[PDB]
From Swiss-Prot:
Binding, Mg(2+): D359, T361, D738, D742
Transmembrane region(s): 38-59, 65-87, 272-293, 301-322, 795-815, 828-846, 877-895, 903-925, 932-952, 960-983
Species of origin: Homo sapiens
All ranges on the Cytoplasmic side of the membrane: 88-271, 323-794, 847-876, 926-931, 984-1000
Name used for this protein in its record: Probable phospholipid-transporting ATPase IIA
Species classification: Eukaryota, Metazoa, Chordata, Craniata, Vertebrata
Function according to Swiss-Prot or TrEMBL: Plays a role in regulating membrane trafficking of cargo proteins, namely endosome to plasma membrane recycling, probably acting through RAB5 and RAB11 activation. Also involved in endosome to trans-Golgi network retrograde transport. In complex with MON2 and DOP1B, regulates SNX3 retromer-mediated endosomal sorting of WLS, a transporter of Wnt morphogens in developing tissues. Participates in the formation of endosomal carriers that direct WLS trafficking back to Golgi, away from lysosomal degradation.
Cofactor: Mg(2+)
Alphabetical keyword list: Acetylation, ATP-binding, Cell membrane, Disease variant, Endosome, Golgi apparatus, Intellectual disability, Lipid transport, Magnesium, Membrane, Metal-binding, Nucleotide-binding, Translocase, Transmembrane, Transmembrane helix, Transport
Name of the coding gene: ATP9A
Amino acid sequence: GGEARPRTVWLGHPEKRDQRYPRNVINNQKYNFFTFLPGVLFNQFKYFFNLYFLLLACSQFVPEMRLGALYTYWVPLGFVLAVTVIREAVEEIRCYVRDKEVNSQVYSRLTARGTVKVKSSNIQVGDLIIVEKNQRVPADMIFLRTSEKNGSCFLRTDQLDGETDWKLRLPVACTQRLPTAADLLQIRSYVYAEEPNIDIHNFVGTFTREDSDPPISESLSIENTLWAGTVVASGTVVGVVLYTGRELRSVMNTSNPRSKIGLFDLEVNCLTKILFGALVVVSLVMVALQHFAGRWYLQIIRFLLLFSNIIPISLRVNLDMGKIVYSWVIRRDSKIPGTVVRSSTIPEQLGRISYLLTDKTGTLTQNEMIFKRLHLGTVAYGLDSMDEVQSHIFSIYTQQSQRTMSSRVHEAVKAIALCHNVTPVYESNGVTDQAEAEKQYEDSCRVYQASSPDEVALVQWTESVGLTLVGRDQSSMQLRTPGDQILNFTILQIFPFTYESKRMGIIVRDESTGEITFYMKGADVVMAGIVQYNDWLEEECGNMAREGLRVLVVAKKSLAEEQYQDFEARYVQAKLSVHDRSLKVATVIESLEMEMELLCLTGVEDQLQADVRPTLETLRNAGIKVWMLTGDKLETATCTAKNAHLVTRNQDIHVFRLVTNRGEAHLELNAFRRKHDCALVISGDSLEVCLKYYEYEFMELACQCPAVVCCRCAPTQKAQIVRLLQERTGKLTCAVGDGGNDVSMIQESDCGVGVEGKEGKQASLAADFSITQFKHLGRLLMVHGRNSYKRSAALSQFVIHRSLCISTMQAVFSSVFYFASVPLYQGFLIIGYSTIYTMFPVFSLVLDKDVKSEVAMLYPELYKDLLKGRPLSYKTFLIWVLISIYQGSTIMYGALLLFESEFVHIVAISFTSLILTELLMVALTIQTWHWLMTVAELLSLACYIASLVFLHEFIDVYFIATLSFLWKVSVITLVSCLPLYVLKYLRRRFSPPSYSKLTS
Ligand SMILES: [Mg+2]
């Protein structure tokens, strides 16, 4: 991993290299065979609460500190180590199997003796790889040759940069003109490529041909590249591989997989630190009552060993079992089918999410644009009134051979059918060959191709209404009428869309009539003054924009012949001149853009995924702030944000202007600060300046917005936003995405959720949790995350309370017997209470729910209570500490008072009291009873009875079987469980929880 260097890549010669290149393998594994065991062990024992029981078990190797048999502390430790190793290994094997599917995709490779199939993982730098239509590009390549006659290809890059526009790509000019694809190996040529980097949108390189009579050299840009993760829209392309594996542009925009620890586990770690300090103090006090007799330091260590008992190990065992249960429940849920849990150790993170950072393309939307509204001023046609438009077109073209509303509809539809840059592409379907279909205009074989998906949606709608674009060229268009006739239009001038002009125009001549028409189409901001005076463009454009529609204004100018020649002369003259050609050309173009007849407004929607709006409403009502981070353009992002109700219909939107330096950023931040309840829409270029100079101020202003949209955001910028939110808020973040540009922020977040993309899987493979639909997020957070958090809290508090009750009982036991370090419990009792005695009543707890799932979904305000840290805090910890001390004191001192023999049977008395006490605990803590709770408690009681009968070392069964013993132990337990009844009464009434009464 040294300095990246530029490379010379010979075409078809992977061996002609001066460096070993990485294998073309995508890897999401945290470890390999060598680092697995050290990595897992260090990630476990670098925290205090694992090293705690490690050292407790290790100190038993010293006989002076020995409190019993060696296995008493190593059978539970062996169980813990086996569980963690097996869990990590299973996760690693699942990751490997899931990466094998992407790495084993098959491609064709150009070889000297013919094309040879190659797996994606065996592709080397210098290979000539063939990628078919709708197939993912497996490695970074230079476009060399395409089978399509136009000598170009379209790429879908939404998995690479989240952009909905299709990218036009051009092959190397020399290689495209070769007679055959086999000629690539017959020429001496190489590509001089730059060093690998994270720049997805810029490439510098040179193509050289050496065997040519004149030395052929050609400059390369991003227009000649096919990066891995892009999809070929049409035709089979041939490329030469430049980068593979970890040097891929998409891979270099990702970080290494890391082990994530939840915030709940860190809180339990802090609790264990506090408990250890407290027990250290207690041991210092307890050996002081010995008057430091003998080896006082050995006494300190022995008392620390006794008072810890099962505090760290039982916590670990029960928390691990609970996390297994939570992941099992999530994976089996049929209301969020297909959910995959990769990070099984952090399901409680989903219960405490404050910021949701979401992707746009492919995550909120289906990446399928559709025509929605045709507005003609007096009449507007929606999805339910398209038969009216079809009837108008049909009547026009029927009465043609055998103003009115039909004429206006026809004018609008023809303008939509003509003013675009969409090309029909015909492909053979077996029955009809492409040449046959391209001449007969076969409907089933036709596909519409353009850079803009909005234009493709418009052309598809126009076909569905009666006018079909059936052929195109650089100088001609063909339309098919409902009477099956063909109308030919000569394209005289074309004014392609630019993101600066925000409009597109075309001049055509109708060969049937000879009339010359100038059509223009663009945004309302630039087309409000280009069209003639009206009274509805602004209002209806605003209404359509408020619904989340992409609005275009379509205008028309009928040109006389002399006018067209006069314009054409000046346009040619301005084009020929090289002295500021752009400005003169622009002036000549806008010489025509005036007093244009307004035809219609068009509305195209980027279709959201199912139940996106209710899910966003639920997340907002749960107290979660949602930010949209997208690589797509500003207009599309704003339209989708309004469509998905990320921004409320009446909400103010402040679009951050482009800033380039410190002063501009300061001025615009002030301008935004002067606003209230305003959503922020900012671009990545201005966001870069703001985070460079005013990170604190920008973060403080953005965290008080109702919603934030970051468009044209690079993967590193998304990760930076996630990291900055974590740093400056101290709260948890969830990143949701579907593409490779979302991997960095998914890894950066406290809880990564990856949506399974249509044409990519990297985000799902790299995420902690994988879902198939964005709507599953609502249930995954409100039900499973909330239950995981609350169950883990109750689990951990119960385990700590039991351990501290045992500790207080041991303290009283030692005090009774001259403050000696004699264990109260030893042998199988310690092992059982560490592992098996504890798993049953707390499995009963991991089955518990405070409310039903439907109630949790219906009332998201239950989530905001968890966002306050209510389930576990220092408050509840202190109350449980006091309760444990009270119960241990009550049990020990009641045994002292009631049993005539002081402490000879104290082990049996305390064991029976603890058994009945935990039965009363589980009976009084559970809120929604489950039959498996009864089964588990029956199993626990069976285990307790089996231990009582078979443990003759410290239990005398014939002493237990006595009415005197029975009533004494019953009274002790009833007195000890007073705080249980107090807490149960406070929960039942006189302080009702908010989750119970809200239903009715
Ligand atoms: Mg995406």
